[PDB]
Design a protein around this nucleic acid. Structure first.
Lengths: 51, 534
DNA sequence: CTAGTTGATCTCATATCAGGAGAAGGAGCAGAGCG
DNA sequence: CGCTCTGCTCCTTCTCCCATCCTCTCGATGGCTATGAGATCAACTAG
C-alpha cells in the first residue's frame, strides 16, 4: 500500500523546487526496483540477478 | 487442380499463378496446418508473401478441410499502411472471402464490437492494426479465431511490449508471421517470435538466452578462446536445426534467376571531424559527465545521445555565415556538400537519410541555403498526405533530393525515381539502415543505385557502425551459416567513450579490423559423437 | 452528416570508552524412565 | 543398554527505553535522462 499525498506532503521551498518526503523517495526506490525486477523476470536475466 | 498428400485441393486457376517458391511456401504452410503448428515466412521483402498466404487460405477454404467446415474466422494483424492493400489482394485473388477492415476509416459505420461479432459469425477475414489488438485485447479474443497472421511480425520483436502480450493472448494453433527479418538486433527477437508461433518449442527465455545467446556472442569475438568459438558453433547449429522446420526463409540468391536485379555498390566514407567539432567532442569525452558515466552514477544513454549529436553537428549539442546549422562546422556536412554538388552536376536524384529529425531540419536549412530543389517527408507530416509527396518525387525529375529519417513511412515506401542514396548517420539497429538502403533499391528500379554511409572516424559513430555490423553478423550466423570468420574484439567493441581520430598515417579502425579483405543406431551415434566433439 | 487537419496521449526503440534490563533461543548436560 | 525427553543453568542475541516545556542561531537541502515514429482519438475547420 502506497499512502496518499497527505501522509507524504511535497513541501514547496522558497522558490519552485518541490521537495518530496522521505516516504516518497523510498517509494521511488521501491517502484524502481519493482519495475526492474518485473522486466528482469519478463526478459533475459540470470537467476542470481533476479535473486 | 494440384493435390497434396492427405488431400488439400488448392485450385488450379490460383495455383498456376504462383511461382515455384510460392508453391513451395504454400506446401510448407499446409504442412504446418496438418501438424497444427505455426511458422515464420521469413522470406525477405519483394518475393511476395501475401500472395502465398491468400493462396493457402483460399485453398484451405475451397478444399473444405476439417471443427470448422473449411476455413474459419482469421485475424490479420498488419501495419495500418498496408491494411487496404490486403483487402484488395483478397478481392482480386479469392473474391468470396468476406474480408473486412477494423479501422476508424473502415466501412462498418457502427459499433466495432458488432463488427467483430458479425465477422466471426460469418467466418470472415478480419484485418486489424497492432494497436487494436493491444487495446481490445480482451474483447477481440473471444470469438474462436482459426488463424492469426501477424504481417510484419517483427512488431513482436520485444518480449516485453504490450503488443507482444496482446498478440500471444490468442488461442489458436495457427500462428503465421510475415517478417522480412525474424531477428534485427539480437536473439531476444528470435525468441519472442518463436514464443508467438509455437509456445513450447524454444524454451523459456532465460533458458534460451543462457543456452544460445551468451555462447554465440561470446564466440562472435576474435579474441575468444578456441573452446568458446567451438561451443558457439555447436550451439548455433542446434538452434538452426531446432528452428529449421518452422522458419521458411529464402534469400535473393536462389530466386535471383527468376527476377531481375540491378547491381548495387556501397561505400562507407570516413569523414574527419572538424577542428571545432573535434574540440567539442574531446571536451565532452574529458568532461566529468563521461567520468560519472564510467562510474555508473549517471545513465550512459544521455552521453550516447550527446556524442551522436556532436558527430552529427556541434550546433545540436552546443545549441552572417554563423546562423543555426552552418554546414561548414561538421565534416559530414562537408562531404554532403561535395556529394550533393557532384550529383546535381551529374543529374542524378538523391535520398538523404538521417536518424535525427533535428539534424534532418538542419539539413533542410542547409539545402535552402543552397539552391537545390527538395522535398521533405518525416513523422511530422500527416499520414493522409504521405502518398502524394512520394508520387510527386517519383513521377518527375524537377525535384532533386528527398529527405527521410530511416524509420518514417510504411515499410518500403516506393521511392524508385531516386538514383543515389546517402545515409547521413548510422543507427544501432542494422535493420533500419538496411531498410534505408533497400527502400531506394527495390523491385522495378531502373538504374544502378549506390549507398554512401557517412561516418566520423574514431568517434561514437564508428562504434555504432561496428555494432551494426556485429549484429548483422550475428543474424547471418544464426540464419544462413554458422561457420564465419571472426571480426571483433570484446573490449574494443564495447568501449565507446573515446576519441582517436585518424591522422592518415595509420589506417582507420574498420580497415584495421577488416585487414584481410528408421535410423540404424550408428548414424544416430555418429551424429551424437560428432556434435559432442565440437 | 464527412473529410481533413491538428493537437494530446500512449506505445516502442536503440544505447551498459562511563547502559541497563528483561525476554527468547539455543546449547551443554544431568538424570530419569523405559523399551 | 542405549535412546528419548525432558527440564535446569549459562551464554547469547535482541530489542526496548531513557523529564517537561520554551527561545534562538546556523548549515544543508536544490534532481535534470533524449529522441522519434505509429496509432487512436477527440476536437476544430471547412465542406
Amino acid at each position: 500500500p502506497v499512502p496518499p499525498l497527505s501522509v507524504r506532503p511535497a513541501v514547496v521551498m522558497q522558490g519552485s523546487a518541490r521537495n518530496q518526503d522521505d516516504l516518497t523517495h523510498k517509494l521511488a526506490d521501491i517502484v524502481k526496483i519493482n519495475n526492474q525486477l518485473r522486466r528482469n523476470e519478463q526478459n533475459g536475466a540470470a537467476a542470481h540477478v533476479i535473486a | 487442380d494440384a493435390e497434396f498428400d492427405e488431400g488439400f485441393k488448392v485450385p488450379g486457376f490460383l495455383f498456376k499463378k504462383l511461382f515455384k517458391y510460392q508453391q513451395t511456401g504454400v506446401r510448407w504452410l499446409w504442412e504446418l496446418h496438418c501438424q497444427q503448428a505455426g511458422g515464420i515466412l521469413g522470406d525477405e521483402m519483394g518475393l511476395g508473401k501475401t500472395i502465398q498466404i491468400i493462396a493457402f487460405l483460399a485453398g484451405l477454404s475451397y478444399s473444405k478441410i476439417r471443427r470448422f467446415e473449411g476455413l474459419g474466422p482469421t485475424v490479420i494483424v498488419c501495419p495500418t499502411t498496408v491494411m487496404h492493400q490486403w483487402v484488395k489482394e483478397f478481392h482480386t485473388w479469392w473474391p468470396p472471402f468476406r474480408v473486412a477492415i477494423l479501422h476508424e476509416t473502415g466501412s462498418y459505420t457502427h459499433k466495432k464490437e458488432k463488427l467483430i461479432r458479425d465477422v466471426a459469425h460469418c467466418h470472415g477475414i478480419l484485418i486489424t492494426s497492432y494497436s487494436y489488438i493491444r487495446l481490445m485485447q480482451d474483447d477481440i479474443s473471444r470469438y474462436d479465431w482459426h488463424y492469426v497472421i501477424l504481417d510484419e511480425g517483427h512488431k513482436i520483436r520485444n518480449p516485453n511490449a504490450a503488443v507482444t502480450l496482446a498478440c500471444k493472448q490468442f488461442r489458436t494453433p495457427h500462428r503465421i508471421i510475415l517478417s522480412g527479418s525474424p531477428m534485427q538486433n539480437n536473439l531476444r527477437e528470435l525468441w519472442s517470435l518463436f514464443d508467438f508461433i509455437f509456445p513450447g518449442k524454444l524454451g523459456t527465455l532465460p533458458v534460451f538466452m543462457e543456452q544460445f545467446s551468451v555462447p554465440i556472442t561470446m564466440g562472435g569475438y576474435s579474441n575468444a578462446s578456441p573452446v568458446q568459438v567451438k561451443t558457439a558453433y555447436k550451439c548455433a547449429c542446434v538452434l538452426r536445426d531446432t528452428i529449421n522446420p518452422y522458419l521458411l526463409r529464402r534469400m535473393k540468391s536462389d530466386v535471383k534467376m527468376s527476377l531481375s536485379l540491378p547491381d548495387k555498390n556501397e561505400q562507407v566514407l570516413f569523414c574527419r571531424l572538424t577542428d571545432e567539432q573535434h574540440k567539442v567532442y574531446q571536451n565532452f569525452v574529458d568532461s566529468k559527465e563521461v567520468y560519472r558515466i564510467l562510474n555508473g552514477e549517471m545513465q550512459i544513454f544521455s552521453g550516447l545521445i550527446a556524442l551522436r549529436k556532436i558527430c552529427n553537428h556541434p550546433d545540436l549539442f552546443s545549441g552572417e555565415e554563423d546562423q543555426f546549422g552552418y554546414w561548414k562546422r561538421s565534416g559530414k556536412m562537408i562531404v554532403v556538400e561535395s556529394l550533393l554538388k557532384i550529383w546535381h552536376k551529374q543529374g542524378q536524384r538523391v535520398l538523404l537519410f538521417s536518424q535525427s529529425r533535428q539534424m534532418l531540419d538542419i539539413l533542410e536549412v542547409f539545402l535552402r541555403a543552397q539552391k537545390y530543389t527538395y522535398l521533405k517527408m518525416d513523422g511530422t507530416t500527416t499520414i493522409a498526405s504521405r502518398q502524394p509527396l512520394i508520387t510527386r518525387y517519383n513521377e518527375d525529375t524537377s525535384i532533386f533530393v528527398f529527405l527521410l529519417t530511416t524509420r518514417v513511412g510504411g515499410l518500403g515506401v516506393n521511392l524508385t525515381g531516386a538514383n543515389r542514396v546517402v545515409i547521413y548517420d548510422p543507427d544501432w539497429n542494422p535493420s533500419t539502415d538496411t531498410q534505408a538502403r533497400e527502400r531506394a533499391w527495390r523491385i522495378g528500379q531502373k538504374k544502378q543505385v549506390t549507398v554512401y554511409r557517412l561516418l566520423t572516424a574514431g568517434t561514437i559513430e564508428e562504434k555504432i557502425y561496428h555494432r551494426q555490423i556485429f549484429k548483422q553478423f550475428l543474424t547471418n550466423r544464426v540464419l544462413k551459416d554458422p561457420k564465419q570468420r571472426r571480426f571483433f574484439k570484446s573490449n574494443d567493441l564495447y568501449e565507446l567513450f573515446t576519441l582517436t581520430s585518424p591522422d592518415a598515417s595509420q589506417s582507420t579502425e574498420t580497415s584495421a579490423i577488416f585487414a584481410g579483405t528408421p535410423l540404424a543406431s550408428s548414424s544416430l551415434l555418429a551424429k551424437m559423437r560428432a556434435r559432442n566433439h565440437l
